[PDB]
Design a binder for this molecule. Structure first.
Ligand SMILES: [Cl-]
Ligand SMILES: [Mg+2]
Ligand SMILES: [Mg+2]
Ligand SMILES: [Mg+2]
Ligand SMILES: [Mg+2]
Ligand SMILES: [Mg+2]
Ligand SMILES: [Mg+2]
Ligand SMILES: [Mg+2]
Ligand SMILES: [Mg+2]
Ligand SMILES: [Mg+2]
Ligand SMILES: [Mg+2]
Ligand SMILES: [Mg+2]
Ligand SMILES: [Mg+2]
Lengths: 319, 319, 319, 319, 319
C-alpha cells in the first residue's frame, strides 16, 4: 500500500513527522484519491475545503487547522521546514498575516518559500552568465574559450527552465486571481464554519486579504520573469556581438593573408624568372658581367613594384 | 456504400467489433451525415446528445449507453482497445470516474490515451535530441557529424509536429472549458433523461466533475507543451553554440595558417635572394670564400627576423 | 458609367450571366454605393439584409432569393461556376445544407470554394518545398544548388502569402462567430419575412446552423494555418541545418588546407637550405663526396619531422 | 503668446486661413489648454463635444459646424487642403457620407487622407525593396553590392517606421470601435442639440454609421499592415538566402583553393627533390646520362600521382 | 529601528525634510507594515485611502493632505524635488490639474517625472546607438571597430532595460485604467469625506479626470515603447547588414586569393619544369644554344596560358 511521508504543522506551530497510508490520509482529510495525485507541476486547487498546492517537488495540503507537507524526504527541505516554518507560523517570522486565519499564514509561507527559491536560482545564474558573457565578448580575443561556451550553454538551459517555472507560477497565481470564486474558495476557514465567521469577521474581508497576498506574490514573480527575460535578451545580444567579432577577426586575418599572398606571388614570379635564367644550359649572356647584377636588380625591383601594385589593387577592390 | 468499422463498448465493458453502413450508423445514433464527417483533427463536439471526438487517427462517438471507435484498423489500436479499454471502463482501471456516468469514463479513457500518446512521443524524442545535441556541441570537435545533423533535423520536425498536436489539444480543451454551455452539453446522460437525473443526482454536479476532468487533462497537456517548448529552445541554443564553436575553430585554424604563411613568405623572399645570387652567370664574387657562408647566414637570420617581425605585426593587428 | 459583370444563380440553380450598370445593381439590391466598393480583401458583411463577401478576387452578393458573382471574368472561374455551382446549389452536390434556406447553401459553397483554393495552394507548395529542402540539406554536398535556393525563396514567399490569406480568412470567420448579432444577421431569409419564418421554422434554429457551418470552416482554416506554420518552421530549421553543414565543410577544408600548408612550409624551409647550399659560389665542401647525400638526407628527414611536429601542434591547438 | 495657424472649413466648404492665439482658440472651442496639447502621435479623442485628432503632423479639431487644421505650414499640406478638402466636403468628392452630418464627412476626409498617405508610403517602399532584394539574391553573384545593402537598410528602417504608424493607427481605431460610448461620443452633432436630433434623425442611426466608417478604415489599415508584414518577412527570407549563397560561394572557392594547394604541395615536394639533387656538390651520378631524364620523369609522374591521390583523399573526406 | 527619510510637501507646496521611525510613519498614515514594504518595482496601489507608488528608486505616498517621498537620499533627487515640486504643486508649474484636488497634482507630478526620466534615457540612448550603427554599417570598411561593438552591446543592454521599464509602467497604468474600481479608489480626497464632496463636486467627475490623466500618461509611455522597439528593430537590421557586409568582403578577398593562388600554381609548375631541367646533371641538350631560350619562352608562355585557363575555369565555376 502506497504511503505519504507527512510533516504536519498545527496552528500552534508544532511539528509532527510521520508516515500514513494514502487511504487513511484521504479519510482524514475528507478527500478522494484523485485530489492528491499531484500530477501537475505548479497547481493550486481547492477541493472539499482543502487547499492542494504543488510547486515542483513541494506538495502541500492546507486545512483550516493544520498544514501537511508530503514526500518531503531527499529534497533538502529539512532545514527550511524544521527551522523556518515553526517560526513563520507561530513565532516572530516575517509573515504579515498573523491576525488572519491559519490558511493565510500557510499560503504566505509556501508562496514565500517558492519565491525565495526562484530568486535564489536567478541570483545564482545571473553573476555566472554575466561573467561568462563578459569574458566571451572581449574584443581583443581572436577566438573564444569553448569551455566557457559549454558553461554558457548549461547556464542558458538552466535559465530557460527557471523562466518556465516563473511563467507557470505566474499563470497559476493569475488564474486564481482572475476569478473571485477561487479567491472565496481559498478562504477555507471562512467556509468551514460560515455561521461562526458571519459574526467573527469584525469588518475584515478574507477574500480581499487573499487577493492582496496573491497580488503581492504575482508582482514578485513578474519582477523575476522580467529579470530572467532581460538576461535571455542579453545572452542573445552577446551571441550576436560574438559572431560579429569573430567575423571581423576573420576578415582582418584574411586581409593580412591576402597581402602576404600577393607578396609571395610577386616573389615567385621573379623567382621563376631567375631560375629560368639560371638553368644549366649554354646561353649567350654568361660572358657579360653587368648582366647578373642587372638581372637581380630588376628582379627585386619588379617584385617590389608588383607587390605595391597588387596592394593598390586590393585597396581599390575593398574600397 | 461507405461503411464504418465500429468497435462498441457497452456500459458493462463488453467489446463488439463489426462493420456498419454509414446511413445505418446515422440512423442508430440519431445523427446527420455532416456530424460524422471527421474532417477536423482534434475536434470535440456535442451533436444530438452525442459526443463526437477526433484526435488525429482516433475517431470516437460517446453515447449515454455505449462508446464507438470508428476506422480503428491498420492503426495499432488493437492492443490498446482490446486490453486497456474493457479494464478501464468496467474493471480495475486507473479511471477515477467510476461513480460518475458512463460518458465520464469514456471521455477520461480517450483523453488519457491521447495524453499517454503525446507523453510517449515526447519521451521518445527527448533522449534522442538531448544525446544528439550533446554530441554536436562538443567543444573539442573541429567539425560536426552531419549524419547527426540529419538526425537532429528529423527529430526537430517530429518535435514541431508534436508541439502542434499538443497546442491543438490544449486549444480544444480550453475552448470547451471556457463556456459553461459546452460543459453542460458534455453531460449526455444528464440531458438524455433530465426528469430521471433531476432526482438521481444526489447533490453531485455533473458539470463540475466534467470541468475538473477537463482541467486535469488541460494541465497535463500544458506541462507537455512546456516541456516541448523547452526542448525547442534548447535546440536553438545548441545550434547557436555550434555556430560559435565552428567560427572559433575557423579563427584558430586561420591564425595558424597566417603564421605559417608569414614564415613561408619570409623563406620565399630569402630564397629569391639565394636563387638570384645562384644563377649560372659570371659574377665578381665567385673567387671569395667567406661570401657563400655570409650569404647563407644572412639569408637564414633575415628569414627568422622577418618571420618574428611579421608575427609581432599580426599580434598587434589582432590586439 | 461603371458596370458589373454579374453571374446570377437563383434558388433553382439556373445560371444567368450579364452586365449591369452599378446604379441599376444598387437599386435592384437595395444597397448603397459604399456597400459594393469591395475595397477589403476577405471581408464578410451584412448590409440591408444582403451578404456581401469578398475573398481576394471572388466578389459575391447573397440575397434571400439569388446569388450574384461580380467581376468573374479573366479569373479562371468559368469552370468552377458553370460546373460546380449549379450542382452544389440545386443538384447532388456535397453541400449539407439542403433543408436550410438558400443563403446557407450559398455561404457553404463560397466558403468551400475558398477553403479548396487554399488547400490546393498548400498541397502544391508543400511537395515542392519538401523536395527542395531534402535536396538542400543533403549532408554529402559541399555546396548547395543556388537555383534550388531561388526556387525555395519563391516558394517561401508564396507560402507566406498563403499563410496571410489563411490568417485573414480565420480572422473574418472568428470575428463573425464571436458576436451573436452577426450570426443572426447572416440569416437573411429569416429577417426578410420574420412573420412568415416565425411559424415556418419548425423548431430549427437558423443561427445555430450558421454557427455550426462557420465553425466547421474556421476549423478547416485552422488546420490549414497549422500546416502552413509547420512548413515555415521546417524551412527555418532546414536553413539552420544548411548553415551548420556549410560551416562544417568549410572547417574540414580549412583543416586539410592547413595541414598541406604546414607540409609546404617544411618543404620550403628545407628547400631554402638546399638552394642556399647550392648557389654558384666557391665553398669548402665541394670536394667531399658524402656531404651531398648527407645534406639531401637530412633535408628530407627534417622536412618530414617538422611536418609531423606541426601536425601534432595543430592537433593540440584544436584539442 | 503661443499661436495656432488655423485653417477652417465650414459646412459649406469655404476655406479661411488665419492665426489665432491659443487662449482665444480655447475660448472659441470651449476647450481647456490640456485638450489641445497634441502630445500624442495618432490620438483620437472627444472633449467637450469636439473631436481632437492627431495623425503625426496632422492636427485637427472637428466641431459640429466646422473643421480646423492646426500647424499646417511647412508640411506640404497646402495642395491637399486647398484642392481636395473643399471638393470632398462640399463638392463632388469621393466621400460617401453626404447625407450624414458634417462631422462624418470631416472624419472620413481625415481618415482617407491618412490611409492614402500610408498607402503611398507602402507603394513607394515596396518596388524599391523588391528590386533591391531581386538584385541581391541573384545566385550568379559571388559577392553582393554593398551600396544596395545600404539602400536596403534605409528602406527597411522606413518600412519599420511605416509599420509602426499603421499599427498605432489600427490600435486607435480599434480602441474607439470596441467601446460603444466612444462611438456615441464621436457623433458630435447628435449631442450638440439632442432635442433637435431626437426628431431630426428619421430612423438613421449615427452611431451605426460611425461604426461602419471606422470599421472600413480599420480594415484598410489591416490590409496595409498585412502587406507591410509580408514585405518584412520577404526581407528576412531574402537575407537568409543571401547568407546561404555567400556561404556556398565561399565553400566552392575554398574547394578550388584546396585542390590548387594540393597540386602546389606535390609540385613543391618534387621540386625539393629536384633542387636537392641539383645543388653545387660533387656526387656519383653526374657521369650517368639516363639519370637526368629518369629523375625528371619520376618527378613529374610522382607530382601527378600525388596530386591525384590527394584529390581522391579530399573527395573521400567531403563524401 | 528602521527609519524612513521623508520629504513632505503639503497642499501649499511647503517642503519639510526629516527622518521618522517606520512604526511612527505607519501610525501617522494609518497604514500597516506590509503596505510600505516597497518590494515591487513600478507598483501603484491604494491602501486605506492612501496612494502608494513605487517607480524604481522613487517611493511616494500620496495623502489627501500631503505628499511623502521616502528614501530620496543618494539618488540625485534633490534638484528635482527642491526645485520643480514646489513650483509644480503650488506655483506656476506645467501641471494642468490645479482646480482638481491635491492628489491629482501629486499623481501628475510623479507620472510626469517618471515619463521625463524615461524620455531622457531614450534621448540619450538613441543618438549614441544611431551613430554607432552608422559607423558600423559603413560599406567601405573591410572589418568593423570592435570597441564600437562593445559600446553598441552596452547601449543595447541599456535599451533593453529601458524598454522593460516602459513596459512595466504601461502595464501598471493599463491595469489601473481597466478597472473602474481602481480609478474610483485613486480619488482619495473624494472618499476621505464623501459627505463633503457629495456637494463640493459641482458637476465635476474626479474619476473621469483621473482616467484622462492616466490615459495621457499611458499614451506617452506607449509612444516611448514604440520608439524603443523601433530602435531595437533597427539594431537587429543593422547587425544583419553587418553580417552580409563582412561575408561579402570575405568572398571578395577569397576570390582575389584564389586568383593569385592559381597564378602561383602555374608559376610553380613551370618553375618545377625549369628546376628539373636545370639540375647539376649531364644531359644531351647543353650543347644546343636555342634550347635555353626555347625552354624559358615556353615556360613563361605556358604559365600565362595556364593562369588564364584557370581564371576561366573559376569564372565558369562561379557562374
Ligand atoms: Cl567564414
Ligand atoms: Mg523544469
Ligand atoms: Mg486583481
Ligand atoms: Mg501532423
Ligand atoms: Mg475554469
Ligand atoms: Mg645551379
Ligand atoms: Mg497577397
Ligand atoms: Mg462558439
Ligand atoms: Mg557565418
Ligand atoms: Mg516614426
Ligand atoms: Mg464591431
Ligand atoms: Mg532594470
Ligand atoms: Mg478606458
Amino acid at each position: 500500500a502506497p504511503v505519504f511521508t507527512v510533516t504536519k504543522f498545527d496552528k500552534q506551530g508544532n511539528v509532527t513527522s510521520f508516515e500514513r497510508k494514502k487511504t487513511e490520509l484521504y479519510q482524514e482529510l475528507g478527500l478522494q484519491a484523485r485530489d492528491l495525485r499531484f500530477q501537475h507541476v505548479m497547481s493550486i486547487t481547492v477541493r472539499n475545503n482543502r487547499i492542494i498546492m504543488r510547486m515542483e517537488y513541494l506538495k502541500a495540503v492546507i486545512t483550516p487547522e493544520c498544514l501537511l507537507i508530503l514526500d518531503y524526504r531527499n529534497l533538502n527541505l529539512e532545514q527550511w521546514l524544521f527551522r523556518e516554518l515553526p517560526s513563520q507560523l507561530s513565532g516572530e517570522g516575517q509573515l504579515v498575516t498573523y491576525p488572519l486565519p491559519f490558511e493565510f499564514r500557510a499560503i504566505e509561507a509556501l508562496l514565500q518559500y517558492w519565491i525565495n527559491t526562484l530568486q535564489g536560482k536567478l541570483s545564482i545564474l545571473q553573476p555566472l552568465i554575466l561573467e561568462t558573457l563578459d569574458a566571451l565578448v572581449d574584443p581583443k580575443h581572436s577566438s573564444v574559450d569553448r569551455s566557457k561556451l559549454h558553461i554558457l550553454l548549461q547556464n542558458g538551459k538552466s535559465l530557460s527552465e527557471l523562466e518556465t517555472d516563473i511563467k507557470i507560477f505566474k499563470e497559476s497565481i493569475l488564474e486564481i486571481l482572475d476569478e473571485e470564486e477561487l479567491l472565496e474558495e481559498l478562504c477555507v476557514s471562512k467556509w468551514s464554519d460560515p455561521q461562526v465567521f458571519e459574526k467573527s469577521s469584525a469588518g475584515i474581508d478574507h477574500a480581499e486579504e487573499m487577493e492582496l497576498l496573491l497580488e503581492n506574490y504575482y508582482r514578485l514573480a513578474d519582477d523575476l520573469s522580467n529579470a530572467a527575460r532581460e538576461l535571455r535578451v542579453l545572452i542573445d545580444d552577446s551571441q550576436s556581438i560574438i559572431f560579429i567579432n569573430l567575423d571581423s577577426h576573420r576578415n582582418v586575418m584574411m586581409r593580412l593573408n591576402l597581402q602576404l599572398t600577393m607578396g609571395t606571388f610577386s616573389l615567385s614570379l621573379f623567382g621563376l624568372m631567375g631560375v629560368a635564367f639560371g638553368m644549366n644550359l649554354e646561353s649567350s649572356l654568361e660572358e657579360d658581367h653587368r648582366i647578373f647584377w642587372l638581372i637581380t636588380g630588376i628582379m627585386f625591383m619588379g617584385s617590389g613594384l608588383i607587390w605595391r601594385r597588387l596592394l593598390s589593387f586590393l585597396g581599390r577592390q575593398l574600397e
